[PDB]
């Protein structure tokens, strides 16, 4: 307001357990302090005034007001600060993610006196967590439906092929599922396009699933992509996929939006299919380290809106400056109580009130020599997608699936007995690749990686 401390920057204020906290990282223009920039971010996310000329006639103010209760500098960087501000609970609709987004990040990111702004974390109170539905099924139910205990699950996207007929698509899916994989994923660009409409694809994929599951003895699946132009078309695809008896479907939660994702999650909860979420068009929002919305915020919003699997990206090829952040966020979507720890990026203590967890999917150019690492980083509550590490085996589709299956079971069997998986990954794989030609061929072309000196 004036030299009077702005009535929005109140450092002596401690927040109640029914307040939504938010942590921005901001960098201001030359010649502007930090406290005023914090109070201005606080005033932009709510009533856009510092004074009381509009918002005071009889009583209706000082309640719907976002106080800013902490500001500190970032270590290492200069002219860059953290601002913690806290919103009441009465500003937000009950059960809507759209409203929370458009109320926090509505029009503050265009503030002129700020050079750049990033939203690093967020804390939902329990009173607000309990008005959303959450994931349709979760982790334990999703593990019980398919009857897969102990090991992580395997999958194989069919990415580089495009312009295949519907029947050859069904054929490749059959060869992959019969060989020993569990899931199989559609390319995410594949919708009903003139060379391959959707109903034909659904038909032949369902036939392949039934054949392979009948002649193998366990439960197989295929993530059918139900992303559509309208609510009607999308619900129609989903109903037809349920009719054929499919266990799981797929969606894109950033190009289609949050209204469509919430609608689909409620349908899936009513009708008993599992939902796999695919994060596409995300680097447009959370790549640069100085502007945008970090991805852990969107992971939380997805755990609230709905979804059972979520892509989180591997950590086999990162340093501990980002491996830490990815592990931190992975824990943020499996457990039930996460304590504040800034080394892993968690800013606030979040309690999830017995809401189920989602399941992380690790994908993208991985092969057999990575299996020791993954199996002990993500643990065994995860999914592993093998794009090229399966379809490129020297002699077919089914042998590649068999090779990956053998490697996975070797690594997990070994892990239980106590053997290390950082010292003894290579020799585990080599000792296993002696009574099976498939794993020998797969170990041949793919090269060993030698993570570091001896560990990590």
């Amino acid at each position: 307001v004036k030299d009077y401390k702005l009535t929005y920057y109140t450092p002596d204020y401690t927040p109640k357990d029914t307040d939504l906290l938010a942590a921005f990282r901001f960098s201001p223009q030359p010649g502007v302090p930090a406290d005023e920039a914090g109070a201005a971010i606080a005033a932009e996310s709510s009533t856009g005034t510092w004074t009381t000329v509009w918002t005071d006639l009889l009583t209706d103010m000082d309640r719907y007001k976002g106080k800013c209760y902490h500001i500190e500098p970032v270590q290492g960087e200069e002219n860059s600060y953290f601002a913690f501000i806290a919103y009441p609970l009465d500003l937000f609709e009950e059960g809507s993610v759209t409203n929370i987004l458009t109320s926090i990040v509505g029009n503050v990111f265009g503030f002129k006196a700020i050079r750049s702004l990033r939203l690093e974390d967020i804390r939902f109170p329990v009173a607000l967590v309990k008005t959303f539905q959450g994931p349709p099924h979760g982790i334990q139910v999703e593990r019980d439906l398919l009857n897969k205990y102990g090991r992580p699950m395997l999958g194989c996207t069919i990415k580089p092929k495009l312009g295949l007929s519907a029947k050859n698509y069904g054929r490749a899916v059959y060869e992959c599922l019969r060989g020993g994989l569990d899931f199989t994923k559609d390319d995410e660009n594949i919708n009903s396009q003139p060379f391959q409409r959707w109903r034909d694809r659904f038909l032949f994929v369902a036939d392949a699933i039934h054949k392979s599951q009948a002649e193998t003895g366990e439960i197989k699946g295929h993530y059918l992509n139900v992303t559509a132009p309208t609510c009607e078309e999308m619900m129609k695809r989903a109903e037809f996929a349920k009719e054929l008896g499919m266990p799981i479907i797929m969606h894109d939660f950033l190009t289609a939006g949050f209204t469509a994702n919430t609608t689909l999650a409620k349908w899936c909860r009513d009708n008993g299919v599992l939902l796999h979420i695919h994060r596409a068009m995300h680097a447009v929002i959370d790549r640069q380290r100085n502007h945008g919305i970090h991805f852990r915020v969107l992971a939380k919003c997805l755990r609230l809106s709905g979804g059972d699997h979520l892509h989180s990206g591997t950590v086999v090829g990162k340093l501990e400056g980002d491996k830490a952040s990815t592990l931190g966020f992975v824990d943020l979507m499996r457990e039930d109580h996460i304590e504040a720890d800034r080394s892993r990026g968690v800013f606030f203590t979040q309690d999830w009130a017995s809401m189920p967890g989602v399941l992380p999917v690790a994908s993208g150019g991985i092969h057999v020599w990575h299996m020791p690492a993954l199996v002990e980083i993500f643990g065994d509550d995860s999914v592993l997608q093998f794009g090229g590490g399966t379809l490129g085996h020297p002699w077919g589709n089914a042998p590649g699936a068999t090779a990956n299956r053998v490697a996975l079971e070797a690594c997990v069997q070994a892990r239980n007995e106590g053997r290390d998986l950082y010292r003894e990954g290579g020799d585990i794989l080599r000792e296993a690749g002696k009574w099976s030609p498939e794993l020998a061929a797969a170990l041949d072309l793919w090269k060993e990686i030698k993570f570091e000196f001896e560990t990590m």
């Binding site: 009857n147 193998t216 003895g217 304590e339 504040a340 080394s343 239980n416 106590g418």
Partner: protein, 207 residues
């Protein structure tokens, strides 16, 4: 009935020294009759898997669900990895009726620190949640190479790993607010070295 095309399969599995000369139906009958202790007929299901029997088929015949089968196999393996090393026979004389669920959470640890973790978990009388958090803290300890007071908590004792977890979680706060002191007092109630104790006393009580 051979389940078609299961190429992913070990050649065979080790059997105990007693049941080396039984057929498949003998295994089925001793499983369905519970006619042993769990660590005696866990290798039998582990071996039956490698003859074309799927966990649903074993569940149909014997009557143990798949989650219990997996827990039994992993628990027997962890118990063998414990007993084959330095120990005293009292805990293996204690892991005879209902030790599978507790042995299932320490499977994350290598054989060295396994026998050290077992003592803690059976002396403090802890359940699955505490065992999971203990194993997670032990595995998180090594990658905190640089921190505040890291080398004052040793590595070869589980209580000190857990105490370091609590201490670092409490330090991520400000002066008492009754939320830091609770965690310091939790950390002091589990540590078992002496540098840990005098450091946590320096912290919680008087500079």
């Amino acid at each position: 009935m051979q389940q078609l095309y299961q190429p992913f399969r070990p050649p065979s599995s080790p059997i105990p020294t007693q049941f080396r000369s039984l057929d498949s139906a003998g295994k089925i009958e001793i499983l369905a009759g519970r006619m042993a202790l769990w660590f005696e007929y866990a290798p039998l299901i582990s071996s039956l898997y490698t003859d074309g029997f799927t966990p649903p088929t074993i569940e149909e015949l014997t009557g143990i669900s798949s989650i219990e089968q997996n827990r039994l196999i992993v628990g027997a393996q962890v118990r063998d990895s414990i007993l084959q090393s330095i120990h005293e026979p009292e805990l293996i004389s204690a892991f005879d009726t209902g030790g599978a669920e507790l042995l299932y959470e320490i499977r994350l640890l290598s054989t060295t620190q396994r026998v050290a973790a077992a003592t803690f978990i059976i002396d403090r009388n802890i359940d699955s949640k505490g065992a999971q958090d203990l194993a997670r803290a032990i595995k998180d300890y090594p990658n905190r190479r640089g921190d505040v007071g890291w080398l004052d908590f040793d590595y070869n004792l589980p209580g000190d790993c857990l105490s370091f977890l609590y201490y670092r979680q409490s330090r991520e706060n400000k002066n008492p607010s009754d939320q830091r002191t609770s965690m310091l007092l939790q950390a002091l109630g589990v540590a078992e070295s002496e540098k840990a104790k005098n450091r946590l006393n320096t912290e919680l009580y008087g500079d």
